[PDB]
Every structure is written in structure tokens, then in C-alpha cells.
Amino acid sequence: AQLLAANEQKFKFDPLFLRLFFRESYPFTTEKVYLSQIPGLVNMALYVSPIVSGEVIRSRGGSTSEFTPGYVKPKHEVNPQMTLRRLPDEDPQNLADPAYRRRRIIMQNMRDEELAIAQVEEMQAVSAVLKGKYTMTGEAFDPVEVDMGRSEENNITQSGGTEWSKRDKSTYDPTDDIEAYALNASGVVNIIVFDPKGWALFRSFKAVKEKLDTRRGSNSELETAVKDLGKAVSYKGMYGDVAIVVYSGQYVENGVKKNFLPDNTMVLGNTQARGLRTYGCIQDADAQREGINASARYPKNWVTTGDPAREFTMIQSAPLMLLADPDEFVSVQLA
Amino acid sequence: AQLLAANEQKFKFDPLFLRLFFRESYPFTTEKVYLSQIPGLVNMALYVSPIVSGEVIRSRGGSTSEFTPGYVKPKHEVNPQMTLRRLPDEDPQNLADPAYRRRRIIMQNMRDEELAIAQVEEMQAVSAVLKGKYTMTGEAFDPVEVDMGRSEENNITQSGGTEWSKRDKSTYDPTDDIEAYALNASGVVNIIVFDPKGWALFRSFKAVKEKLDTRRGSNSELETAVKDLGKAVSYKGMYGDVAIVVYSGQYVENGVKKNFLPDNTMVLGNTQARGLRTYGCIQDADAQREGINASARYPKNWVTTGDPAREFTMIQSAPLMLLADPDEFVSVQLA
Amino acid sequence: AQLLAANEQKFKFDPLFLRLFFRESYPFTTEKVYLSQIPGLVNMALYVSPIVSGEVIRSRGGSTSEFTPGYVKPKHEVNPQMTLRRLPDEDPQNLADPAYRRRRIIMQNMRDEELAIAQVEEMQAVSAVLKGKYTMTGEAFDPVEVDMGRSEENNITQSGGTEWSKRDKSTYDPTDDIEAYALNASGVVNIIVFDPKGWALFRSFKAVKEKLDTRRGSNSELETAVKDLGKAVSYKGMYGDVAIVVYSGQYVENGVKKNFLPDNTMVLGNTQARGLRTYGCIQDADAQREGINASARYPKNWVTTGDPAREFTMIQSAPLMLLADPDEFVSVQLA
């Protein structure tokens, strides 16, 4: 059987949300995820004369704690009938070796497994930053709710008398409307990432293209962080002090593709916003014995006997994406 | 006769369709091609409970999983009278000996056999992704039809009603048309490869000229993948987010050179698409006897006696150029 | 733990459809079943000249492929407490040894495995040639559809138009109706398989009673099938050139017995009709580890650890009882 240390992946393919907002991670050593354990923020200094001692500082972070993360654990078989990919310039002599073929199959199954986990880790992020409400469902899970604690004003949808679709396409300037939306953002807005269906509406305005300086090179760091996803994400240009990204990544259902975002929607935030990546206990009998109770991922390979007689490789984790200031992003439902 | 070791070519000149979309290859160990063994696409992760239970994931192949490969075995003769081409740095003194003349004519036959096979493979790939459908024909061979499953929404015909050739060349902006045609691409496009004749009408508009970039290219390693194909491939620049390539390849029929693409056409798509390069078995006694049934190419040299007392060279293969998702591209039929 | 050498069933008990139409069996080597790999029939040898190269015959034709098998795996436990079924003409002295008693109860348990899988094969076969369409389903196995391609011209229902009950049971003749039913058979028909209570009404006609022949012996080799399954199969005699046989077989559901053929049915076919007996792979780690992928049955004895700590016996199969051509039978729904 493959050793547990066979974890040679080193691929970082975070789809534009775990790579820009949810950088820091907090794996937990307890089963449930207790929100009151995060480091939190800090008071100013509390001036004190240098003859008397000062009160010790204590930061706690959040009140509602007893959350519960999902415990996704996809499996795969290693049936040695798959037609292995012809790696460039590899010899055919090595392909005859059963051990090398088995190792190649295990390595490909690891990639397939890790691409299956990040889908949930990004669906959680998308759901968190659209409404601040996110429920976990699935067969045999007892659906668990997650209330991030959003305000109400940070969901402004254009549904009044005048919308961006049913007005003038030559004289209207959306700068004022965008600033009005970003006023209640509890900070300086920096990213106005679009869903391309909703993007095409904004793009039609000439007042946009008359001032959208879409020069190549976003800010010298954003395009460095987003070139890896040449399939899903794209960069439009700079709208002055802010940049525009078009995110079109799709999450696959049992057999069908679906969009992460509703088509005619946009969301505003910052690249410096902090997003928690809290995990939970990897409740495994062997993982407890190897002292890896608190960790991000946990591969395992075993050989089953008798009824489902096969060899399985499984990846298990516990994603409970969170935010510190959920009301800093504003998700505008366009029309 | 020269042995199987006469395979010293190691030249990678696959022309823009086997290198940009069909990079990965899946040679098979059976007469036909079955999509069941193909890894396919990863599914969702399916939240489950803790160690209580766990369900096994199987990656199926869908509905159709049986295709017939396009077997091919072009033959050449090695008559030691053909006047050798004056390749540079070639001394005739160490050339008059037949031991070198034959050894070089063998290599020349290998080169043009491989060139013909690779060019037919590219023709197959273009016929595949220009319209989604495909066929196999030929004298002394049973016709075979191959259907990728392209959606009808990805075959936009420009001739109907609103073309590009009948608009003002200084006021009409074709960005809106490109956006409207690339909206239904099931993924952000970055490659808008044109035709040598089809690019003229697109570029004739003035609005493109100022916005169009020529700055040597700043997209990716794509410029390196283009510089090797200096003859029939030209890289123009930036449309703002996508790259522009004008490709004017040619292939030799019975006696006439023709282009791969229909005259006034263009394609949009992604440079990160998944293009299958499935191959059948090399149904030869020696290949099976040497365990080389699963391979992309098979050279062979022998001498037949009695009626055709001549020495021959063969390169056997069986391409079935296939595309994972045909709906990731848009084929605009310009007019 | 008994090894795979415990294969001593030695019982040939094919019930009248695996013996009359589905004689030829073909265990596949791929998980899914592709009919484009069936050898097919053989034609007359050409009169090739002596001193000339011959021509290679191709034993292929007819795709109709892509059918998946209905994997079946019934378990049993071998707890040594049950009173052993004492076989007639056996030595009772060596029954004292528990090691022999366990080895005998293993085979007594294996017989039930074989019978309970033969019943599933009969369920596959009987209604295979009754409509063409076949839905295989059950718990822990999602429903699967298998369609032969029978035409509506081959499934005449007597209820359409004129019934048979509302007719004179002493003067009317069904010969014209029989010929009309047999005209759309794409081949001569000589079997008139009935249902006993659906055959009583057919026999109720006066002319049929004396018209039916009851001569000794079948045509060539039809009485041979009767001599084996005499409990539920009866051969009335001759009806010109078509044989009258009555199948009153039953299969056991959980605790109740059901008849194989629905009430009012009669099938018109040929004894030489080709009926496939395809199979799937033995999806088991030990099967690949011992190279027994292409097999119909697969015994296994093994020991469970911990929760149901017992020793089990299991047989795995994959019956996909299939017809070479759906248009060789006519299944009249009597009325």
C-alpha cells in the first residue's frame, strides 16, 4: 500500500476567492468549529504613566461559536483498466511494469480528488459573499445553517423605477451609481468583479469605454495572481482607482455544469479583506494515531476485502469558510 | 534491413491544433476506442456525515463509448537511385558510398511519412472543431462518421441578415458582435483565430486599429508556441483581453494545395481546452510480438521478395482526433 | 477458508429458454457489453483458385452495442448450526468431523447461490423475448433500460379489434390468425409456447382438438428438452410444422411463487433463432489479481472482522440475457 507521506501535489489552484480573500487558514483541533477562538482585533494603546502598571490586553473575537463544518470525504477506486495518459517522451518499457502503472493511477486519482474538494471550498466562498447566508445540505447530512451576520443594506439590488438595462445607453454615467452602492461598504472599495452575463450589460455604456483604461497590466500583482486560471477568470481593465475582473468558473453537478454566480450580478469588496479558512477535526482512526488530528487535508489508501473487494483512495477535510467583516462586500443583483 | 531503432526524429512541429488544444493523448490497447476508460471530468464533492458512512464515486463515460479509429499505413519505396536533396554541410565524398546514401534516404522517407501523418491529424482536428461533426472516407475503406455532439448555438452564421462586410468601415464597432457571439461559449475565450482572408474585413474597421495591440505579445508562452510555426502562423496582438492569431496552413491533395479552413470563417475558444488524442492499436504481427500494440506511431522496414522484389518503409498509425467538450468554441461563418 | 477450487456445482439446469434460444454464451472482458465484438455467423467458402492468394474472412457485423450488465451478488452465511440435508447414498460415518460438515454446508449453500442466480437469468430471458424492452432495477442498483429494437408489428395484442373469447368455441378456426401473426416474423416459426390457462381457451376450439397431432416423439430434438424439466414443461404435439409446448414454470419471490409468463401470452419463434448469453466483468480485486475477468460465475469464501464477525460465501455474476435479432419472434397478447 502507498505510504501516507505520498502527498506530492504542490499545486495551488485556488479559484480567485480562496486566493484573494481567504488567504489565512485556521485548522482546528476540536470536532466542531468554535468561532470565539479566532485572534481578533486589537485596542489602541490605553495611555498609561510609566510608574503604574497597565491592564493586560485580551482579545476574544466573535460571540456565536458552536458551528459545525461539513465532512466531505470523496473516494476513488484504482481499477487498473483505465487507459493511462501518454506522458510526453516516456518510454513504453516502463508502462509494462504493473507497479509504475499503479503509482500513476494513484497519482491521477489524487489530482481528481483534490479538484473535487476545492469545488466545495469555492462554492462556500461564493455563497458566503453573495448574501452572508449559506446552508449545507446533502444526503445523510442533516442540513446545517450558517448565518454570517450580514446587515440588510449590503444587498442593494437595482429593482426600482430605473435600472441599468432600461435607461439611456449613451449619456448615463454609472460612476455615481457605483459610488452610491459602494458608500455602505465599511471601507474603500477595490474590486467590482462581474459575472460575464451581467458584465455585457455594463460594457455597453460608452461612458464606460470612454474612461475604462483597459491597459495591459492590472496593478502588477493582481494579474500575477490570476494568470494561473486561464480557463475561468479574466481581467478587463482599471476603472480609475479600481479594477474589474470577470469570473466565469463553473461548478459541476452530478452530470451537469452550473454557474457559481447568478448571471446578472456583481459584487464589490477589497483584495486586502480578511477571510477565515477554518477547518475541523479529521475524525479518522489512523489520523488520531499519527497525530494529525488538526490538518487541512488527509489522504488515505487502503485495500478492502470480500464484499466490495477493491483498493480505495480517499481524501477528507472539513471546510467552513468564514469572514471577519461580512458586511464589507456589497452584492448587487443587477437587472 | 534497418531495425526498429531507426526512430531518431524527435521533432515537435505539431501545427497549432495538436499543441494548443489537443496536448494530451490517450493511446489504447484495443482495436476500437472506448470512452469509458477515459478519466472524464471530476464531479462535485457531495457533503456527507462523519465516519458513519461513505459512498464510492464512479466516473462513467456517458452514452456513446465506441468509436472506430482511422487506421493508416502509407508506404514508400527505397529505390537507391533517387537524387538526394542538397541538404547543407553535406560532403559528397562521404556520400557516394551506398551505406550512407541508403541510410539517409531511409530517414527522408521517415520524415515525409511523419509529415503526412501529422498533417492529416491536423486536418482531422480542424474538421472536428470547425463544425463539431466529422467523417472518415477513403478509397478501399468503409466510410465512418464521428459526431462530437456540438450544440447548434455554437455555429453562428454571419451571413444571415447582419454581416460585417456591409457596414461603415469607420463607424461600426465589432466589439459588441464579438461579445454577443462569445457569450454562449461555456467559458471565457482567449483565442479568436481568424482566416487569412477573414481577418481583412475584421481589421478594416478603424475602431479596432487604435485599441489593437502589436506589443510583441504579452499573453503567455503562446508566442514561443508560435515562433516555431513562423510560416503559416502569425500572431498579431491584443484585443484587450484575448489573443489574435491568423493561421494560413495548407495541405496537399492529389495535386492541389488547399487551406484547412473554409475561406471566410473564424473561431473563438479557449487555449486551455481539453482535446483528446486517442489512438487505436497498430494491428501488425511485429508490433504485437514486441508489445508495442499501444502506441501513436509504428515504423517498419522490410524487403519483400518474389513478385515485388523491393524494400519498403511503412509508418502505421490510427488517429481518432477527439474533443472533450465541443461547446467550448464558437465557429463564426463570416460572409 | 476454501479457495476458488471449490467449484463442484456440476448441475446443468437451464429452464427451457436458456436451452431453446439462448444456447450460445459469450463472457465479455469489458465492464460494459459491446455487441460489435460478437463473431456472428459463417457463410459458404468461396471457390478460390488453387495457385492464387486467398481472401481473409471478417467475422463481424452489426453494432447495436453499448449495453450494460446487471451485476448480481447474493451473500450467504455459513454458521454451523443448521441441520444438514443428508444426500441420498452418502457415507454417514464421516459426518462427526466438523471440518467435513463445514465443507459440506459450503456446497449446500453454494447450490442455493447457483439456483438463485439461474432464476435471475430466467427473469432476464423470459421477458426479454416478450416485448424487447427490459428494465432491470432493484434496491442499491439504479434502474437500467435495455432495448432490443422490436417493432410494434411484432407485438400484436388480441384485444385490438376482435378478441378470441367472444367467438364460437366449436367452429371458428384460428389458422388464419396464426398465419397473420407469423407473417411478420422475418423467418419460419415452429414453436407455439403457451401459458396453461392461456392455452386452455386455445384448445377449447373443436376443430383444433382433432386437428392437433399427438404422435410419438418430437420433430428431431425437441422431446430431449422435455425429458429434463418434466415438472413444468409439457409437449402437446404437432400442429402441422409448428410444435405446441406449454411452459408452466414458476420463480420464487421473497416468500411467494409467480408464473414466468403472464396470463394470456403466446410466442412465435424458431428453434434456430440466435440468442446471445452475454456477461460482464467480475468486478472484484481478487478477480483481477488472478486474471479471471472473463467469467460468468465467481465463488468466494471469506471472513468478516468485528461487526458481523461471520464467514460468508458469495457468487458474483453479470447476466445480460440478450437476443441477436429482436424481429425473429412474435409475442401475441391473447384475449
What HEC string does C253-304 produce? CCCCEEECCCCCEEEEECCCCCCCCEECCCCCHHHHHHCCCCCCCCEEEEEC
CA distance B61 to B40: 7
What is the SS3 string spanning A90-148?
Answer: CCHHHHHCHHHHHHHHHHHHHHHHHHHHHHHHHHHHHHHHHHCEEEECCCCCCCEEEEC
Q: In chain B, how many H helices and how many E strands?
A: 6, 13
Experimental method: cryo-EM
Distance to chain C for A6, nearest Cα, Å: 22
* Contact flag B240-A235 (C-beta cutoff 8 Å): no
Output the CA–CA distances (angstroms, integers) from residue A102 to A78, A107, C264, in the order listed.
Answer: 8, 9, 56
Chain C residues within 8 A of A311 when measuring between CB atoms = 285
Chain B residues within 8 A of C36 when measuring between CB atoms = 32, 66
Distance to chain B for A48, nearest Cα, Å: 52
Side chain identity, residue A263: D
* Contact flag C312-A304 (C-beta cutoff 8 Å): no
Which of B18, B12, B22, B16 shows the shortest CA–CA distance to B249?
A: B16
CA distance A104 to B121: 28
Chain A residues within 8 A of C286 when measuring between CB atoms = 309
Long-range contacts at A147-152 (CB < 8 A, ≥ 24 apart): A147/A64, A148/A322, A148/A323, A148/A326, A149/A64, A149/A326, A149/A327, A150/A326, A150/A327, A151/A327
Count of other CB atoms within 10 angstroms of residue C285: 18
What is the three-class DSSP state of C72?
Answer: strand
Output the CA–CA distances (angstroms, integers) from residue B198 to B165, B191, B193, B332, in the order listed.
Answer: 10, 15, 10, 10
Count of other CB atoms within 10 angstroms of residue B11: 9
Top residue of A301, A304, A305, A312 to mutate, by most chain C CBs within 10 Å, is A305
Residue written as grid cell 446471445: C276
Question: Resolution of this entry in Å?
Answer: 3.9
* Contact flag C34-B66 (C-beta cutoff 8 Å): yes
For the record, the C-alpha cell of C13 comes out as 439446469
**Contact in structure between B270 and B4 (CB atoms under 8 Å):** no
Top residue of A13, A30, A83 to mutate, by most chain B CBs within 10 Å, is A83
Secondary structure letter of residue B32 according to DSSP: S
CA angle C128, C279, C59 (to 5 degrees): 95
Nearest residue of B to residue A318, measured between CA atoms:
B47
Helix B175-182 / helix A196-203 crossing angle, nearest 10 deg: 160
* Contact flag A81-C286 (C-beta cutoff 8 Å): no
CA angle C86, C89, C91 (to 5 degrees): 75
Nearest residue of A to residue C74, measured between CA atoms:
A307
Chain C residues within 8 A of A304 when measuring between CB atoms = 285
Nearest residue of A to residue B35, measured between CA atoms:
A83
Chain A to chain B Cβ contacts (< 8 Å)? 134
Top residue of A79, A86, A203 to mutate, by most chain B CBs within 10 Å, is A86
**Contact in structure between B34 and B63 (CB atoms under 8 Å):** no
Secondary structure letter of residue A200 according to DSSP: H
User: What is the extent of the structural domain holding B253?
Assistant: 152-274+326-333
User: Which residues share a beta bridge with C317?
Assistant: C72
Facing residue for C288 by CB, picked from A80, A303, A307: A80
Facing residue for B44 by CB, picked from A73, A92, A251: A251
CA angle B36, B42, B48 (to 5 degrees): 115
Altogether, the residues listed in chain A come to a count of: 335
Radius of gyration of chain A (CA): 24
Pairing relationship of beta strands A265-268 and A330-333 according to DSSP bridges: antiparallel
Distance to chain B for A292, nearest Cα, Å: 16
Residue written as grid cell 364460437: C168
For the record, the C-alpha cell of A291 comes out as 497525530
For the record, the C-alpha cell of C41 comes out as 455467423
Nearest residue of B to residue C35, measured between CA atoms:
B66
Radius of gyration of chain B (CA): 24
| Phi and psi torsions of A117, nearest 5° | -80, -45
Facing residue for A309 by CB, picked from C31, C284, C303: C284
CA distance C214 to C218: 10
Chain B residues within 8 A of A70 when measuring between CB atoms = 47
* Contact flag B176-A204 (C-beta cutoff 8 Å): yes
For the record, the C-alpha cell of C316 comes out as 458474483
CA distance B226 to B244: 12
CA distance C241 to C221: 14
CA distance A224 to A133: 31
Altogether, the residues listed in chain B come to a count of: 335
CA angle C302, C303, C304 (to 5 degrees): 125
Nearest residue of B to residue C140, measured between CA atoms:
B55
Output the CA–CA distances (angstroms, integers) from residue C110 to C95, C113, C116, C170, C256, in the order listed.
Answer: 19, 5, 10, 52, 22
What is the SS3 string spanning C101-118?
Answer: HHHHHHHHHHHHHHHHHH
Distance to chain C for B76, nearest Cα, Å: 23
CA distance A325 to A298: 30
CA distance C193 to C198: 10
Query: What does the DSSP assignment read for B107-172?
Result: HHHHHHHHHHHHHHHHHHHHHHHHHSEEEE--TTS--EEEE----GGG--BSSSS--STTS-TTT-
Facing residue for A136 by CB, picked from B47, B271, B295: B47
Secondary structure letter of residue A191 according to DSSP: B
Radius of gyration of chain C (CA): 24
Interfacial residues of C (vs A; Cβ cutoff 8 Å): 31, 73, 75, 283-286, 288, 300, 302-304, 312, 314
Distance to chain C for A9, nearest Cα, Å: 27
| Phi and psi torsions of C181, nearest 5° | -70, -35
**Contact in structure between A202 and A194 (CB atoms under 8 Å):** yes
Nearest residue of A to residue B221, measured between CA atoms:
A227
**Contact in structure between C72 and C117 (CB atoms under 8 Å):** yes
Altogether, the residues listed in chain C come to a count of: 335
For the record, the C-alpha cell of A254 comes out as 452530478
Listed in sequence order, the residues at least 6 apart from C10 whose beta carbon sits closer than 8 Å to its beta carbon are none
